[PDB]
Design a protein around this ligand. Sequence first.
Ligand code: HEM
Ligand SMILES: [Cl-]
Ligand code: NA
Ligand code: NA
Length: 106
Amino acid sequence: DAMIVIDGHGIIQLFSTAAERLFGWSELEAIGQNVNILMPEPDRSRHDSYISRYRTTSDPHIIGIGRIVTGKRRDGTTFPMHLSIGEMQSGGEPYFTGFVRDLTEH
Ligand code: HEM
Ligand SMILES: [Cl-]
Ligand code: NA
Ligand code: NA
């Protein structure tokens, strides 16, 4: 339902309408920010590493695999969500697409 697209450095490039309702940020506020603003520690402080790691090893842990994780809303509250992630190229640069499913109220 909710879709988020980030660039190779973790910066949000697209934030769908459902994502706004789910995380509390507006599309304009979300775009330009690191995707780690949507998660609690320790993932938050480590997410950039996860991405760099994947980019240098090309060994997926979540891409094409999926996982249930905890996200964080604008107000600071945490919730369960399923995440599916894909990768694609545009203009020779990588972009990651994420499908987010809220398990708090599906
Ligand atoms: C908001 C909650 C999110 C959490 C808690 C989270 C958590 C994580 C975790 C735990 C890993 C590494 C897993 C491991 O090493 O075992 C990871 C990897 C990754 N995440 Fe996230 N993530 C979140 C959102 C996103 C979104 C929205 C995208 C993309 C639009 C994204 C893209 C990636 C990428 C590219 C990787 C590396 C790919 C891989 O290792 O398969 N993440 N994330
Ligand atoms: Cl999946
Ligand atoms: Na912005
Ligand atoms: Na899975």
